[PDB]
Each structure stands twice: as structure tokens, then as C-alpha cells.
Design a protein around this nucleic acid. Sequence first.
RNA 1: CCACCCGAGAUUGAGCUAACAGGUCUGUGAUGCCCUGUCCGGGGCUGCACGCGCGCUACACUGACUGGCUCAGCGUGUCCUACGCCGGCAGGCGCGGGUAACCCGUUGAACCCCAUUCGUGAUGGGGAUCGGGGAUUGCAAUUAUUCCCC
Lengths: 125, 32, 220
Amino acid sequence: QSVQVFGRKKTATAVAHCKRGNGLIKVNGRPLEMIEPRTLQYKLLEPVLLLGKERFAGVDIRVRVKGGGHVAQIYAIRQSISKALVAYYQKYVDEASKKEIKDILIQYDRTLLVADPRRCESKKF
Amino acid sequence: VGPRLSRRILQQARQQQEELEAERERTTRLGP
Amino acid sequence: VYHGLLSFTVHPKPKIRKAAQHGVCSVLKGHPAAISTAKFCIQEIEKSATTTLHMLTLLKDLLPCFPEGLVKSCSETLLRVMTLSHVLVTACAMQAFHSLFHARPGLSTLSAELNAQIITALYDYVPSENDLQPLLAWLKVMEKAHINLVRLQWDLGLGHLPRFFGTAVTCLLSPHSQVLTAATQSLKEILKECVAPHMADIGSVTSSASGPAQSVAKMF
RNA sequence: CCACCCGAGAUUGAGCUAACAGGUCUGUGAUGCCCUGUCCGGGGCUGCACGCGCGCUACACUGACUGGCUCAGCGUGUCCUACGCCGGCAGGCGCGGGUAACCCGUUGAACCCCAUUCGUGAUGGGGAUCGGGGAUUGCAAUUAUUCCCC
């Protein structure tokens, strides 16, 4: 059993696949804890810290990320992992955990589940 | 989403599906 | 005398070459001399690069009037030059396959087992996904080969159809509109001419079919 | 569109070619008016005391240098270019793809991020202006076309 969700930012897109596993997190085939900017490392790590590593202990995810810049890619990744876990605990796990987890994410940060629809404006002749 | 970003997302998800499904010379003679 | 007429095809002047080619085609189509000219074409290909297209034009114009073993050897040599990545030889020899399967040859020229083998061998190229010059010819010759296989032996043709239908459905994801229309037209032609009239013979298909009904269920 | 039933009528009578502010074309007025250059060579096209304005680069430590790491989009292309070889660099040679969501191109961009040197110094900030040499586009680079090294 597996799900596939996406998150976005200005142009950065992240596609996350969520399968039964043991708690290893892959983004572009690379581990979560080695993505280049360390100054935003906790911004990458907020869903795990808010939910605990025990909720991730029976699942694995792989995220392919394309577009954007460094920061936009990080935000798309965190939206992708949050939406992937919400979709998985909605589809194959009971709904009460999905609702309480969704409440935790949305009280901490709306952009963990709702896309920011801001993009560059066009210039007209 | 809109055309361009959704197109990129769709092709990206398709490539992820194929790389999940992923994990000799041409038939030079007709009869064995 | 036939050898003397045949030897001037590879002559570099177009007026000499075209006249020799048309004369050989008129002699064969107007046969005990087919084996000799087929062996001459095979040896001329194996010797050689621009003359390759010339006796490939000979092969395109002369494949139906050949014996079965010489057809098999010619197709083996043709797939040998398919091992090269040159584009013009690929397009011309796909045109040769089109002329071979379009004429609907008899059992003496082409057998059903040979058709099944050449169908299974042609699956290895499928140029990439979106080339649209050789993919059109590849779909067209595979369509004609499947039509000829169904015409020879219908149950084997329907058995081999689901793989081609799956590849056509996959090829419908190409961004080109022309290849999509061509795949739709090819599958429609196979459904109308090769699938429809045999359904009284096949009968009703359920989820536990065995014979050609299971193949129909698979391509559905 | 055709034919037909019903229906009085499923079409019977009146009025309306025209138009050229787009024009064109060798004609008509003893038509009104005002008068009686080309090719060629060379140079200059801001040459600079100054006044008034757009801009680019900086006056550094929230920075410069060296190395490492890792992410775009709108477009364009028979001049865009992959790749191989030579040179330290500009560049040179050969061999392929692309009239294109097919090839450049999974456009391996820069800021940014991570380590090194620097230490308040008109200084490793800043690059103007010059001296020497090489290369490239052109018929032709002098009054520096453009690029590279010191």
C-alpha cells in the first residue's frame, strides 16, 4: 500500500511517494538530514519533531524535487512530507489519527498543508 | 494549479512511477 | 544474362541504376531467378554506404516475390543493418517491411511461424517514445505484420495482439498528435478487420478465459 | 436539403442595378501655381575647459580571494551546439544532433550555502589609465572593433 502526493512553492515542486517501511527518509534519493542548507535544517525537520519519530517508524518515503531555488525546494519538500503522511493515515490507517495530526500541522503552520499561491508578476507593454 | 506547474508535476510523478517500477544485443537472427 | 542485368544496379549513375532496378523488377514481375537475386542482394549488403539504400530499394520492390528461406535470410541481414544507428537505412528498411507485409504474401513466401518470430524480433527497437518519423513506420509495419499473421493463423495473431495493444496504449502518452492519431487508426483497423469477424468463433469471454478469449480480455 | 399529409395560403405580387474617401492605367483643359545631380578615394560622426541629466562599477568585515556543494524560468536556434583531440587562455582542427516540447537541455546560472587566506590598512577594497605579447570577425582594426595573459 502506497500513496503519491505533491507540494509546491513559487516554481519548486516536490512529489512524495509514501510506502510501508521502517523510518528512512529519502529526497531525490538523498537522506533528509544532508540537504545543503543547514540553516533551514529544522524547517526541513518540523513534521518529524512535532509528530515524533515513532509515527514515522513504520513508513518510508521518497521525494523527487524539481524546480525553484534552495528555499523554495525546502518548503515544497516539507509540504510534500506533511501531505504524504496525512494521505497515508487517511487511506490505510484510521481517520482519527489523520484528523488530530492534520490539526497539529495546521495549528503550527498552514503552509505545511495549504500552498502559498504567490508567484512573480508579469510586466506589460 | 494552472497548466505549466501541473504539467511539470504530472511528468515528475510519472518519472517517479517509472523509477519505482524499474527496481543484451538486438535479435540479430530470426531462428534459433 | 540475368546476372549481367542485375550487376549494374550498384552503378553510381542514377540513370543506369534506376533503369537496371526497374528492369529487374519488371523481369521478376513478368520465379526461378528469385533465389539468385536475393543472394546477390544479401552479398551486396554484407560487402558494404550509399549503395546500401539502393539494394534496399531493390529489397523494397522485390520482397514479395522471394522464397521463404531467402526472406528469412534477408530479414536477418536487415536486422543486422538495424544494429547500426543510421537513420536513412532504418527508414528505408521499414519501408521494405511495409512493402513486404502490405502485399499479403502467401504461405510459400511467408509462414505464420516466421511472421511470429519477426513480430517478436521487431519489439526490440521502438525508437524512443517521440521520434515520430521512425515510430510511425514501426507502428505501421507492426500493424501490417499483425494483420498478415491473423490472416494466416487467427488464434496466434489474437494471442500476440495484447502486447502490441499495450505498447500502443503506452505510445499514446507521446506528446505528438500524429502518432496518437496513427495509433488510434491502427488499433481501430485491427479491431475492425482482425478482431470483429472471429468473435462468433471465440464466443463469450469471462474472467477465467483460457484461449484467444483471454487474450481479448488482456488487450481490453 | 428533399418529398409528403393537413391547411385557403408551405411562397403570389409591388418597390429596391448601385458604390470607390483603396485606387490604378499615357487621355482629355493653348488647366492654377513655384523654379530654369551622379559616381570614386580619404576623413568626421563628440573630437573636451564646462553647465544640466540618465546609467554601470565601488568606497569593503552583513566583505574580497581560493576550493567544495547544490537549485530556475521566459525564450531563441541553420546558426544553436553535444562530443573527441591540441594549447595555460582566448582560440584551432575533426566528427554528430537540431526547420526543434525529439538536439543544445534532467538549460549542472549567479546570488545563496559550507571550509581556507585576509584584519581597519586608499590594504589581498576599487578598478580607471597605461606598457608588452597572443588570438579572433572583417576587403580594411591606425584615433586603441572584440577577447585573452602579465
